[PDB]
DNA sequence: TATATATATATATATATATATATATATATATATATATATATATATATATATATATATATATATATATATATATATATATATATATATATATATATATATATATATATATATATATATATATATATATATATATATATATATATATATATATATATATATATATATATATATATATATATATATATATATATATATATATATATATATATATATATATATATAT
DNA sequence: ATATATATATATATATATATATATATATATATATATATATATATATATATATATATATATATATATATATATATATATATATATATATATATATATATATATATATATATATATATATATATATATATATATATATATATATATATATATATATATATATATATATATATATATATATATATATATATATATATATATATATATATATATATATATATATATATA
């Protein structure tokens, strides 16, 4: 028993590893080219909307997952973080009130799902234009977060999940960290991507 | 893809396709020389075979859900487009509350698919005849949960 | 239950999926080359006609569907814009009062009805010349839609439906987005694609 | 990969990748001559098959526990997150005491897993009818571990 | 019998073995350039964590085994420096109490398996910023190593594993041997793989 | 490589790997040639099939001796690291004295051994019901000493 | 190489290796072309397979000769080394003297080969009782020479 | 140039820090000088494109003939020039081959054993990894499947008529090409048949005996 | 029982030799001749088909239009929802296998030595031969082209003229006008970059110091070869 500790996050190859399995899958229903053309196109759709937002919100959001929770079992958390930017905001299609109704129904305390709700909010309005002008100039707070969410999700109706797919992002060009401004800070991510071919010959 | 009443040709297209995918999945390069073998073909075949019988299995309740949707509407009148959302209505409801009881009551889901059916829930429809009739969405909403609930016998 | 929320649009690859799944399909039937031209000028009228018609008309009214009956109900609307599109304008098959009477049949509000059409004709008259001839330079209203596109329509028999496929927009060339006067604007779109050739070699 | 109930979908499902890596494996590059050949082409079928039948007979114990676990959950209306998680504890507790016994006291594994499990050990829990109830984890960890002896008969 | 002695260590070669065989393994899933930057990205990862950690803990170690247990039977130790590694540090999954019980069932004497979690700890908090901010200043010793690390383990709940594995030495730069300060010492390695190149006409 | 109980899946992983080293001997360069020509591929296969049998023909006795190990740490309780040292230790007392006999006598291995066990040789040991115990490695090693001239009919 | 008792494996090795060098020799330079045509590779294989053939043909004399050597050390109880040597020395005096005959008498050979195993020529061997026994090499050495002249009855 | 040590002198290097002079870099903004990019309209300067025709210049293409310079071709014969083939022997040169032995070099092989190299295998814990599997949910992406409708695209289908391109069918005759069929005889290539004898090759068949090989039958011991 | 060995011996037939001889048939020669074909000429004539024209019609089909509608499936959207998979991330946990560690052994191969032999080839030399092809000489004819000449004639091509004429593109004017670029202005902006400042602070260098120390090579001595 106890063979290894495997462990899931973003290496540095998912992307590799996703491009090549489906390419090799696809081969066989494309021919060369356009199964590489297909892959190319959906592992960029893919990365500009779940690596841009779950995963920065996820790297966000785990030291004070461990602060509160600290377990293994923080795995109801993610699913909340994860419904809080899918259902919650971009969609508006549900209030505050399913949330921690549900999450207290799972047994989580509801101050915990308050704040975490408040810090979703304080970075994905970051992130994300739209939800920061919806939300305005608010700070959440476990002791404000869920009236003012529930104002802003009942003042609009049930938005087409169109919006959390693509489009979102797709309609504004947003400033790069390759700029100024706001937009200075980065790129040491991407710069190492640089190194990396020099390095290979390429 | 267009709507298409459930029937065996539909059975036999999954079928097929899923041939198709596997094939594609086990020689991941190597395609044309598993195509050639007549004995990974034949495990390819019995696996689609078993995935085509697991998805069939695993879809009658949802069957179930849109035919008595389907009764509900033409007893009210209503046009086809709203008797297919609320097909899909009565599929969500029994998926995430009848049977797996995610953690949410029916109330909530009910004014969830409220908001969702807003512009404001009476709506007017005019019969072959020209009689306009009104129907309320939350009554016939509620109405189909207790119907729902009488299927399963729950 | 809950499985997956999927979204459906135009992204970016939906011609790569198109020209290789039909392209596998027809190789069957034609050979390698025969089956490769095919495709490529099926997708290229499926482009000129579906895409540069429909898939802008769509992007351009998706707000003010939300703003009006925002639901992921908001079916009702995509039918009738279609039949806008192709049934009163490119057609003259059907009078205003079709479309109204049959909408609230279907229990849509009439004023909202004669909103869409003045828009979805605001819009058309813009993509289309020979409907904005057809029209005359009238801003559409509720208060004026319905009188004005019964004049065009009753004025008109019913066309072939030649006209609404491919020929209207065959015998007539426009002004390119690469051009100067009022062809300047949109070529962003394309950039992007030349940029990704580049990045991959091509 | 997502939550899938096991069946034999999943044995074919693994036999096949596993035929593909197994290609892969033997002609470290002549990958497409080696996938001509008929004769080593039933080598490596029946590698697979051998393969898939090791990891099959050596799953059974897993099944039965994660089969006690949900018993166990059912019984005491318990979501679906702690039923997996207490399913993977009832397996750690089988491999490595049960059956192999790295030098540990089943006590010891026990507030391990205790501590894994704290945020403390009293969840609230809203059942289906809106009636709230709370378990200690502790008890119910220790609870499975004596069911779980019954089951081996140990 | 008596065939022969082999010596299993990292060789120099262990790069280029594990990248060999996993690229040609992998072509047959991916095509050349797809499993090239895979087994790129696999081992660069191999690298940075299990070398950096492990293989430099157990440099350290393996005189310190000799001396106490001198033996090809240094094999329990070897497991314990792995649990201690993996168990207690960087996841505060198990306090010092378990592993001087279960190796003290193993047949390990006490005070020798509190002498090596003295040492093991006294190197990590060289190698790994975080715990030894955990620890901080405190020499561990036979005497008193149990004790502190029991507090801090009691302090900290189980950590997800993704600590230990990617994201510790990810979120965070360190001090080059290429460096001022502390990192002026050990080019010595890298140079010989310079100099390698150069006589290879490389 | 991890630890893994024999089994015919052993076996067909050394059929095939030596089907790559050998396709890898032949065509020193000219690989992909060698490759495609079907005779000097039977050749191969069969090549390989006789070194595999070779193989496992001259390994049985091995087993034997891990088999014997097994069943004496299990009746003293010893845990799994000392029982493949034990396992080594028989295999080379039976490989270098029982089988060849190079030229040494039976207790100098033993006391070699022996300073190989040291640290020094009568190590506690903790079962599963917490009562320590404790063996003396000298004894044990005598032990199966004998226990394996049993064995052989020596 | 290490040392491998004869058997079919070392046959298929030697044919293989053959291959390779005969491939090399026929395409001094163009080796790839002439690796591409079949034709010259079936004439290559079937000039392996009739080299190895000559090979085994001319071996089964020195396979006896090593074998009564062996017989003989194991009824003297000598350690592999010297059963070797003799091995070699029975192969020496068969080839040049009893097959071919050079010009040389036969004791002459026996003292060359005695001058080849000084230091002088009774060796003190510890058999596995503790029994030392001494064994002079010119006896043993006349020894097996008649019982060379034996097997083929010379 | 080496061999021991010691200098100066300067080439780097690495030690710790400090300057100076720079080369960049990122930090925020400001200049100037440029390199591009737009955003709208004006230049002159090519660059093509037209759209109209007209030039000169040359690229080809014809149409008729004439040259010249060549490229082949055939007609007949004659040279040199070298290629390579046979007909006669002789050389050198080296390609293998064989005949006896002796080398060195190396390819394996076996005989003992000893290293090291990594190839796998079996005995217990850590990696990245993917093989997955589950077991719990959540994503995006996708393959499909519905459920209502709407498109465009093409797959057929039917409805009515019209084309075009073919596939056959018929209705008259006329071709060429061919498959046969006759009707006369003549060839050639065969397939058999006969009439005479002779072969070689092999199918059996005898007539005597001798083998090996194996098919079964007749005296006691094992699987 | 059936079948396999360990000796002796039959009969029986399966073949094979060891000689002589049949008859029979399998081919093959050797001549003469049939007869039946398989084709092929040689003329004449059918008949039947395979095509092809030569006109006029069909029906049938293959496509394509020309309008209208289906139903069906191929895709694509439009929205809601499933189900099944392809992946991915979340956390926990097994088993399996694929590579790497961390020790102890195997066996197995890939090598490398450590001695002694083989055997087999790869070459090399040591004499004597071959045959074989590689060339070269020493006397003669073939195609064979490789050229050249020596006349005549083609056809074909390369060009060049000698007229007329196209078409085509190479440029150039003549006029008008586009569109696309190349640079230039004309204003307002960007972004990007080249530098330069304007302060700060790094990082990497090029040097220069400021003490210590290496190794390295540039020289110079201080004895020696």
Known sequence: GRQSH???DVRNDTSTRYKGKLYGIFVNYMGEKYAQQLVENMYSNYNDVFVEIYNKMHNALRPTLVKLAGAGATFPLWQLVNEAIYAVYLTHKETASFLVTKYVARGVPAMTVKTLLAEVGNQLKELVPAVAEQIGSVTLDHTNVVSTVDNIVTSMPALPNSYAGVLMKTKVP???PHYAGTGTFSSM????KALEDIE??? | RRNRR???ASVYRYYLKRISMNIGTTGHVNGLSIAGN?????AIARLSEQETYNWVTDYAPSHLAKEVVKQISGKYNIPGA???LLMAFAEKVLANYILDYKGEPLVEIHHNFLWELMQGFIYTFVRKDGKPVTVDMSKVLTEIEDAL???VKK
Chains 1, 3, 5 share one sequence.
Do not use: D, N, W
């Not at chain 1, 991510?189 to 190492?192: D, K, L, P, R, V």
């Open chain 1, 189 to 192: 991510e991407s710069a190492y």
């Open chain 2, 38 to 42: 007549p004995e990974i073909m034949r």
């Open chain 1, 200 to 202: 290979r010959g390429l």
């Open chain 1, 6 to 8: 495997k462990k899931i």
């Open chain 2, 6 to 8: 459930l029937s065996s």
């Open chain 1, 174 to 176: 947003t400033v790069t």
């Open chain 2, 149 to 151: 609930f009488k299927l």
């Open chain 2, 82 to 84: 709203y008797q297919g």
